[PDB]
């Protein structure tokens, strides 16, 4: 069913002219910031043009399929509803602060471990939920697909190439050189964790896509430095994700029993405040 917006448990009959367009947002991968006139809620709306590129439209619809059946996962962005007009489909998603990539840009430096700990719990539980509940592999884990909001929430973004290929920079060794699969996302999570923890992308000074792949296979996994005060548990987690033999790489169920995960499940970390203060610094 479409033509309904449900926010916080309250469903409102709606059409797209009940929404005020407040402007484009930061994803070319079209999304608008819109305001529900009936309630004042500000939401994100994807506009899928009927006459659009069917390669991209297929991707919007696969992303929407897993989003829609994933409403009981608190670590995946939710869809408030849809509007199917004669010319367009509008997908109303919850509005969040930014992607972890832009956080790294605005921060101009490392993200603290206590924020990465809550993030690591969220993405792992999101990917584990996708595998067990829906048999879905993300295959494109990267900081641009990790979202954060004013209220300390961290959620998996949008997965339009999910299967029941990704960016070459975060691709696992066994996807570069498959000997002949769910552990390929664990590697990209580790590369993203090292990137956000150091403020640098691990494989540095790479000019072409193929050169990045070359250093993934030719060189040792990029682990966390020991002179930044990282906890032993954090380093143990990163080295476990960034294991090069995919058979010796842990599954999600073994990953969730890791001390790093177990600590930040029960440690109250104020992500909301840290997020608002970092977002305050202008450019
Ligand atoms: C970088 C990757 C990404 O997905 N980025 C992204 C950015 C934003 C975003 O920048 N939103 C701006 C914004 C402004 N407010 C705001 C402004 C003034 C006063 C009050 C408020 C609340 N809020 N947000 C948003 C998104 C985004 N939001 N929801 C979704 C859902 C699915 C994908 C992306 C997404 C993402």
Q: Are residues 27 and 151 in the same domain?
A: no
Q: Are residues 88 and 103 in the same domain?
A: no
Distance (Å) from CA 55 to ligand 1 centroid: 25
Q: How many Cβ atoms sit within 10 Å of the Cβ of residue 67? A: 21
Q: Are residues 85 and 117 in the same domain?
A: no
CATH code of 50's domain: 3.30.200.20
Closest CA to 134 of 71, 59, 57: 71
Backbone angles phi, psi at 188, to 5 degrees: -60, -35
- The alpha-carbon radius of gyration of the chain (Å, integer) is 19
Resolution (A): 2.9
From which experimental method does this structure derive?
Answer: X-ray
Q: Where does a domain end: 58, 93, 128?
A: 93
| 10, HSE (Cβ side, Cα atoms, 13 Å) | 4
Q: Decide: 99 in ligand 1 pocket, CB within 6 A.
A: yes
Q: Are residues 125 and 200 in the same domain?
A: yes
Residues 2, 161: Cα–Cα separation, whole Å: 24
* 205: CB partners within 8 A, 6+ apart: none
Backbone angles phi, psi at 170, to 5 degrees: -110, 15
Kindly list the distances between the CA atom of residue 255 and the CA atoms of 120, 183, 258, in Å, as whole numbers in the listed order: 10, 11, 5
Q: Decide: 156 in ligand 1 pocket, CB within 6 A.
A: no
Question: Ligand 1 atom 20: the closest Cα is on which residue?
Answer: 42
Q: Are residues 171 and 83 in the same domain?
A: no
Distance (Å) from CA 215 to ligand 1 centroid: 34
**Nearest atom, ligand 1, residue 94 CA:** 29
209 is annotated as an active-site residue = no
Q: Where does a domain end: 69, 93, 117?
A: 93
Q: Are residues 130 and 25 in the same domain?
A: no
Q: Are residues 14 and 55 in the same domain?
A: yes
- Give the largest CA-CA distance in the chain: 59
Q: Where does a domain end: 72, 93, 114?
A: 93
Range of the domain at 55: 4-93
In this structure, what token pair is assigned to residue 17?
Answer: 């002219």
Kindly list the distances between the CA atom of residue 171 and the CA atoms of 14, 194, 196, 281, in Å, as whole numbers in the listed order: 41, 14, 17, 32
Q: Are residues 102 and 61 in the same domain?
A: no
Q: Are residues 184 and 220 in the same domain?
A: yes
Classified as helix, coil or strand, 12 is strand
Task: Count structural domains, the chain.
Answer: 2
Question: Ligand 1 atom 29: the closest Cα is on which residue?
Answer: 95
Q: Are residues 127 and 70 in the same domain?
A: no
Closest CA to 30 of 93, 80, 74: 93
Classified as helix, coil or strand, 93 is strand
């Amino acid at each position: 069913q479409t033509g309904y917006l449900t926010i916080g448990g309250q469903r409102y009959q709606a059409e797209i002219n009940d929404l005020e367009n407040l402007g484009e947002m930061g994803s070319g991968t079209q999304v608008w910031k819109m305001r529900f006139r009936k309630t004042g809620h500000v939401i994100a709306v994807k506009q899928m043009r009927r006459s659009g590129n069917k390669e991209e439209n297929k991707r919007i619809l696969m992303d929407l399929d897993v989003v829609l059946k994933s409403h009981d996962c608190p670590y995946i962005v939710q869809c408030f509803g849809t509007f199917i007009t004669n010319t367009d489909v509008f997908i109303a998603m919850e509005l969040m602060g930014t992607c972890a990539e832009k956080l790294k840009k605005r921060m101009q430096g490392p993200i603290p471990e206590r924020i990465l700990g809550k993030m690591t719990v969220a993405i792992v539980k999101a990917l584990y939920y996708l595998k067990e509940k829906h048999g879905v592999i993300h295959r494109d884990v990267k900081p641009s697909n990790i979202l954060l909001d004013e209220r300390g929430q961290i959620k998996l973004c949008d997965f339009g190439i999910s299967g029941r290929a990704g960016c070459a920079a975060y691709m696992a060794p066994e996807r570069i050189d498959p000997p002949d699969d769910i552990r390929a996302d664990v590697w990209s999570l580790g590369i993203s964790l090292v990137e956000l923890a150091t403020g640098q992308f691990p494989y540095k000074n790479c000019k072409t896509d193929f050169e990045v792949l070359t250093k993934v296979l030719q060189e040792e996994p990029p682990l966390l430095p020991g002179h930044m005060g990282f906890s032993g548990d954090f380093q143990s987690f990163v080295k476990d994700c960034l294991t090069k033999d995919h058979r010796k790489r842990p599954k999600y169920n073994k990953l969730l029993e890791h001390s790093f995960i177990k600590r930040y499940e029960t440690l109250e970390v104020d992500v909301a405040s840290w997020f608002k203060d970092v977002m305050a610094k202008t450019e």
